Design a protein around this ligand. Structure first.
Ligand SMILES: CCc1csc(-c2cnc[nH]2)n1
Ligand SMILES: CCc1csc(-c2cnc[nH]2)n1
Lengths: 412, 412
């Protein structure tokens, strides 16, 4: 029968920090992680900035010899996973290793490595493709390499659901534990799509902000002057654990994961429906899963991508789900500061939602100077808002009309 | 408790055929689908052959315009999915659309598209990258496009577990139905990695057979002269359905899906452990899940990739799990004919396992001329074997030590 699931460990690389506390400090201070990209020449690109991980040292985690075989998205996913496992205090043993698994996903995976090997193939020939090209690039190898390093013999998989990946990964991992397929899961996502194909491909779709002369103001969810998402890099990982397992070992519990929803829009390959119907169906599924009155929801970490259609669809969905209570909760987009970590967005935002519960504060939506028509909820404009939060919801939406919602609450 | 899950629809593209019955006819005749790769200069490559899908007409499924937006692996996944939904007879309605979902995966995703957009980026710059590059290349777009086309509003996601993808996709879709999150799921996988990057990437790891002179003899699982796997393309999709739902509409039921196992080896990034410990745990997990004794297993569709370490690991795992029953079951590798469809392998091999139950026949392992040291099981060498089959297993083992096992049972 269905078991309860708690969060005992969290790990992160973001444009605001090389771990959770440093990232969260930036979040509560309203700091932007967005800046012109230094790692490549983007003069021919319509977008030349994004949220880079600054000063990442893979030799805090892995030997340089191993690191050279792995795409940055794998290095970032392992860094966050190692932080989360360490933060949990969990000891992996012969007695429990079969009951500990991993589900770390990515939206695009090892695009930098595929681009670099494509350059080798086209300029030199196939004999110059790396022997490590496949295992160092494919999405499942965060889960794979983490399992090999820590000896995790539980369910081992990866999701890829575009901008919903981190949320789906965490929800499905919670279901694994709920249904008894595992007692512990490391789950989240990682992304590093800031290569020519990434910036060029999102640019060709005209999906990205082109505010090159003011990158920190580019990401402006629900602002009338928003012009698309800001592409960002990093990773979030959480240690999910069955409640009685966590209690038995005296784990520190950050919060309980009480609800998960999925729904497909079935609307459009890339565009959300303007009325937010799929996001509303997804939140309702999650609230019913959590056994909640919708009025219990205090804080929503929105998807909040800073796209014209996406941001207004989310307002419509929250009004439709929460009715008059939509005016009482606080909703913010931390993408205002981090940008959009794509497959990692739902993982870092789940962490921010848990910390909103720990610290009783709604992170701000920075840059919300002039809320757009109908964007008249409490969007926590400009500055963090201390408030009562018993229940927090984290939403993600993605290409293919794929929706996820996670519901977290305080654990006493 | 848990609901029962049955297979009511199947669909396929393979190197043997453009649907299930044509593919299955090839399988039972011992036909190879392996041939030198056409319309592609492989002069500089150490492998020049593989399993291509021959004569695929995407305009039976999509307009030319919608097809131009999608990588071949998405086209292939959609073709198998549309076939499987047609084969099931299911009528999607306003009353059931929120209960029908999709989980179609891929191991490597849109390499062909990435390669062609790389060509444009390197030659001409980013402004030649296609606007549909990102949504037309990402792995979750088979689930995305299928849900949009058919109006499916249930759980919408995509697995990517390398060579285990199709097995995990089907198993986790079965869990969605068993635990009441959906009544119907379309599940499986698709792959088209026959680009420079795929043949070059696997070639750089020396993982592929280089038997260019005799492509049809290259895939020879458990044969002492095997020299690695054969890269193949295509897709498999199954309609999974809750039993009472299938019975209420008078569905034709092929078989019941009674068990699903997952395990991680935690051993090596590409190589399985010689003793098959991971595969043994995963099969035992799947049999425990099904409430079946190893003695009840009649037929195993092996992973059987034709790699030195993989094939011998599977013999060891089967001897370990089945003890005095290990010789009584029949175990075959259909990859002897199809080659290795990577993330689609588990999907087309779940279908072949279901048809083994329908037709009471074990498909052959062709090319098994000289079984290797210790390969003395009933590997169905050379010719199909009519026999009693009540319980059939399908195994997949992939990069990162990721394992999956499905258990199917006759339904009457
Ligand atoms: C942690 C496992 C690992 C990292 S890089 C690697 C490897 C490289 N060549 C064989 N194996 N294994
Ligand atoms: C406790 C969180 C944390 C910060 S840095 C870190 C780590 C784990 N392994 C190397 N570094 N864990």
């Amino acid at each position: 029968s269905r078991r309860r699931v708690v969060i005992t460990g969290m790990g992160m690389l973001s444009p605001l920090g090389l771990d959770v506390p440093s990232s969260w400090e930036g979040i509560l201070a309203g700091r932007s992680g967005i800046a012109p990209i230094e790692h490549m020449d983007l003069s021919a690109y319509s977008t030349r900035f994004g949220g880079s991980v600054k000063g990442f040292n893979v030799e805090e985690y892995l030997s340089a010899k191993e690191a050279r075989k792995l795409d940055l998205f794998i290095q970032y996913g392992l860094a966050a996973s190692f932080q989360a496992v360490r933060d949990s205090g969990l000891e992996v043993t012969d007695a429990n290793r079969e009951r500990i698994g991993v589900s770390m996903g990515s939206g695009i995976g090892g695009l930098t490595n595929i681009e670099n090997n494509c350059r080798s193939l086209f300029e030199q020939g196939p004999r110059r493709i790396s022997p490590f090209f496949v295992p160092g690039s494919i999405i499942n190898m965060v889960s794979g390499f983490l399992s090999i390093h820590l000896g995790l013999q539980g369910p081992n998989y990866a999701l890829t659901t575009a901008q919903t990946t981190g949320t789906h990964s965490i929800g499905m991992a919670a279901r694994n534990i709920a249904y008894g397929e595992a007692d512990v899961m490391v789950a989240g996502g990682s992304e590093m799509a800031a290569c020519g194909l990434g910036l060029g491909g999102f640019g060709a779709a005209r999906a990205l902000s082109t505010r090159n002369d003011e990158p920190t103001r580019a990401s402006r969810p629900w602002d009338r002057d928003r012009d698309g998402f800001v592409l960002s890099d990093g990773s979030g990982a959480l240690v999910l654990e069955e409640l009685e397992h966590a209690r038995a070992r005296g784990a520190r519990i950050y919060a309980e994961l009480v609800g998960f929803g999925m729904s497909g829009d079935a609307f459009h390959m890339t565009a959300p429906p303007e009325d937010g119907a799929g996001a509303a169906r997804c939140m309702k599924n999650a609230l019913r899963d959590a056994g909640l009155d919708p009025r219990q929801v205090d804080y929503i970490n929105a998807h909040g991508t800073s796209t014209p259609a996406g941001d207004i669809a989310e307002i419509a969905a929250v009004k439709s789900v929460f009715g008059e209570h939509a005016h009482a909760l606080s909703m913010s987009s931390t993408k205002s500061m981090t940008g959009h970590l794509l497959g990692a967005a739902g993982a870092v935002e789940a962490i921010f939602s848990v910390l909103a519960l720990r610290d009783q504060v709604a992170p701000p939506t920075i840059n919300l100077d002039n809320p757009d028509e109908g964007c008249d909820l409490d969007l926590v404009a400009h500055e963090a808002k201390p408030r009562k939060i018993d229940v927090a919801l984290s939403n993600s939406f993605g290409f293919g009309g794929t929706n996820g919602t996670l519901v977290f609450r305080r654990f006493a």
